[PDB]
Design an enzyme around this catalytic site. Structure first.
Site, PDB file in Angstrom:
ATOM      1  N   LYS A  11       0.820  -1.194   0.000  1.00 36.47           N
ATOM      2  CA  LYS A  11       0.000   0.000   0.000  1.00 36.47           C
ATOM      3  C   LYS A  11       0.867   1.262   0.000  1.00 36.47           C
ATOM      4  CE  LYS A  11      -3.060  -2.407   2.968  1.00 36.47           C
ATOM      5  NZ  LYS A  11      -3.837  -2.104   4.182  1.00 36.47           N
ATOM      6  N   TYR A  51     -12.118  -2.937  -2.738  1.00 37.59           N
ATOM      7  CA  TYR A  51     -12.677  -2.879  -1.400  1.00 37.59           C
ATOM      8  C   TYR A  51     -14.182  -2.980  -1.444  1.00 37.59           C
ATOM      9  CZ  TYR A  51      -8.171  -1.859   0.760  1.00 37.59           C
ATOM     10  OH  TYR A  51      -6.915  -1.964   1.310  1.00 37.59           O
ATOM     11  N   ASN A 114      -1.092  -0.514   7.583  1.00 39.51           N
ATOM     12  CA  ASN A 114      -0.505  -1.809   7.850  1.00 39.51           C
ATOM     13  C   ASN A 114       0.301  -2.347   6.679  1.00 39.51           C
ATOM     14  OD1 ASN A 114      -2.790  -2.510   6.370  1.00 39.51           O
ATOM     15  ND2 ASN A 114      -3.858  -3.394   8.133  1.00 39.51           N
ATOM     16  N   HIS A 117      -1.117  -5.695   1.475  1.00 36.81           N
ATOM     17  CA  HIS A 117      -2.368  -6.382   1.300  1.00 36.81           C
ATOM     18  C   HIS A 117      -2.050  -7.745   0.741  1.00 36.81           C
ATOM     19  CE1 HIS A 117      -6.217  -7.687  -0.266  1.00 36.81           C
ATOM     20  NE2 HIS A 117      -5.538  -8.014  -1.352  1.00 36.81           N
ATOM     21  N   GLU A 128      -8.939 -10.741  -7.157  1.00 37.56           N
ATOM     22  CA  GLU A 128      -7.954  -9.679  -7.020  1.00 37.56           C
ATOM     23  C   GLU A 128      -6.913  -9.726  -8.113  1.00 37.56           C
ATOM     24  OE1 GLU A 128      -6.875 -10.329  -3.031  1.00 37.56           O
ATOM     25  OE2 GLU A 128      -8.648  -9.262  -2.229  1.00 37.56           O
TER      26      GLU A 128
END
Lengths: 150, 150, 150, 150, 150, 150
Positions: A11, A51, A114, A117, A128
């Site tokens: 990310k 998402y 975080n 992904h 994905e």
């Protein structure tokens, strides 16, 4: 079977904190073969597509905002149980509780930020993978190290 | 100026020996900002385009054959004197004589298989960058760490 | 030719300071193939044999004393120009002047205690290899990574 | 007591994937003292001796075939609870489920090819140590770092 | 003699880019003993004292401004030829030309922001040491690893 | 809140085994900001103050003796849930059972000599911080990386 692929995205914070080389290197050590790799800035629809599972939620907005607030390095690795492992390597949701040794446990400190992904299941994996990469962008002839598998 | 970009490609041996994460990480540590990144299998014409400078030479054939014999991870980094540094980081032509600390000195052992490519000058840099990447694929808003430059 | 072998010995200080894994790993990264490996405490005659070239010198006594004052991890690596490279990787005689990146430059600080030994020439290499290892102890079928050599 | 020794063997895949330096280094960091070390190609009877516990099983054949299909770096480390720890460091049977930080979790991906062997108990330890090494090959005067134990 | 000490300061950019652990660790590996260590924000007079040698110069102002613009981790290491080595380890003035393996060559990219300071001579060393540290703050009983020196 | 601070001390064995750079670096990677840092030899009363909670115990004497038997590098890090994490990073009481990836699991081997100290709770944290550092020694304007927190 060792033709399992997963999708991982460093990310914006991971990329912006210089964690790209570390992360790819970790999966290369583990033995997984890099099949697709590209740095891109996600677009609104792609992010909203990604998402999706949360679009009915309040905190879906954030998700999308962030993921598109900066470049993301997307990649697809393939190997035996890659989807399972990759998650193990990446850590839990909360970076703070991720254990030392794991990506988020070593470098992570928030939950919102975080770093990475990883597809959560083989199903979300294929959705994905196809969502972020065009078949053209993915390797076909993988051919993994013969010292990896019996 | 710190808007200088260079082009580097982890050739097939580098990629196939799992050196991708190591190499990107080295440049991220140094402070350079990753502007473009993509794994691809070079095509004959792209390779012939890239090794143009040698097309009149006998050993041009090899060049081209190899570079297209497997996936290559292409990337463009930007920073002050990036073209100069990157070369310094990568090492000399002969891996064996490249000094410890350098990419080729640490992992390299042949000259034909010397893991990585780096534009040799700022001129070859811009030719190489534009040759392998479409403007769409390159970052615009770079914004480098403010602790890097005075 | 890539059938060149050299002889390296992590002397007592290197072994006792826990530098064994680091050193072997460095040569494995570079691509060289480990052909022989054994930890042993050198014996007086072996040491005197090894430091023969200095037996007429005053400081030959020291040489011998030390090398036998503790376990030594002896090993033989093979690869293209291995004898040349290994030295490059190991550093100069004086650890202090060895450059960062090199074995002695990174961990070395004295000259007497300079962690490692590397044959200085291909001639001393074959004398040293045969001197410390019995042919039985050395690999035959080496077979190096095909991504190493053109 | 800190005179406990264990037996570990970097199997053919570990050796052939260049994991030797990494593995030894990990145990040297932890504080364990290297008592015996030798690279050898196991022989049929030694392998059959080592995988005795499974000789009545179908998959004993494989065990033996592999372990002798290439060089193996055998070693014996000594330290407080070395047998227990070493296993902890090495990981579980299935590399994929071994946790990040562990030898198999970091580099492992199959179960058949799981890089390393560690005695499973202190009993199998002494059987394994004596089986692969001649007393001559093992250190006696260990003398571990005094900053390791109270 | 191995009672030589030098003074090094991780400037604000080094500290703010998280280079503190890396730098100390590099000198600990090399074998030097940490004698004094403290994070502090330099004060105007201390900075002006430290960059005295340049007070008659135009670019003295910058020097001082920066060094006091954020915390600095000051430290004193001791060992044989520590002043000489430390510089070697740190690199040249221009990070870009510092060689891979060196502190500035690995992480440095500007000259103004060149991460670290090292006394340039043994004379400037003792002036710098006493200037930043009170005798109370410095170790006396150093006692370096006996595997370091002959 | 990310204004939580904890207190960690690399005890004499950690410092004397050269683990200082490694440990600080681990917390810098995780994202925590170094607020206070100083190497000092603890004094009897400070040690007795620090190991107060055990003064009624038999093994309190040891505690104190050791902690003052050599230099200790004390430090205070700040970040979201720093007290919780730091412990996670450091490992369990018994180094041997600490998991690979953790400070004690990677380098630890005894329980008495377990390299590092970390406040066990936020309460002991503030008592410990104020006990070892004077407010003067602690940063105020922390300002953590903005890619760390949402």
């Amino acid at each position: 079977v060792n033709k399992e692929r997963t999708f991982l995205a460093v990310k914006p914070d991971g990329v912006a904190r210089g964690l790209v080389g570390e992360i790819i290197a970790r999966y290369e050590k583990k033995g997984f073969v890099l099949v697709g790799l590209k740095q891109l800035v996600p677009t609104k629809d792609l992010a909203e597509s990604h998402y999706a599972e949360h679009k009915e939620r309040p905190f879906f907005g954030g998700l999308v905002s962030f993921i598109t607030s900066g470049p993301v390095v997307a990649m697809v690795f393939e190997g035996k149980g890659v989807v399972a492992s990759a998650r193990l390597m990446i850590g839990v949701t909360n970076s703070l509780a991720s254990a030392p040794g794991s990506i988020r446990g070593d470098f992570g400190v928030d939950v919102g930020r975080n770093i990475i992904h990883g597809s959560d299941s083989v199903e979300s994996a294929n959705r994905e993978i196809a969502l972020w990469f065009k078949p053209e962008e993915l390797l076909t002839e993988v051919k993994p190290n013969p010292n990896l598998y019996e």
